[PDB]
Symmetry: C2
Subunit: 62 residues, 2 copies
């Protein structure tokens, strides 16, 4: 019954948006084999996914 709930959740994606695009710059373009630089960046965006689990109940009253 709120509007900020869905709004905030959307802002969280904004961060991953730039992070995903940056992953390509860290790898160059033809990554795949030994591209750890791409994994380091993705790790940051991965954290946002783990937090969403907790924030879910924080915004969703049981």
């Amino acid at each position: 019954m709120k509007k900020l709930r869905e709004e905030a959740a959307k802002l969280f994606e904004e961060w991953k948006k730039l992070a995903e695009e940056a992953a390509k710059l860290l790898e160059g373009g033809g990554g795949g084999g030994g591209g750890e630089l791409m994994k380091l960046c993705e790790e940051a965006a991965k954290k946002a996914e783990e937090l969403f689990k907790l924030a879910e109940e924080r915004l969703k009253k049981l």
Copy 2:
């Protein structure tokens, strides 16, 4: 000068940039009476700053 390594460390700021703006959308003007929602949004951006330390030793061995 530069190639990508240094560019990466600078890109990390991009995320934080949106993180600060998101805090205003989650607070909707201001906090008041504590508010963990604002502290949770900061944690995400806090990790990025903490990663700079690990990335410094990685990208830059010395």
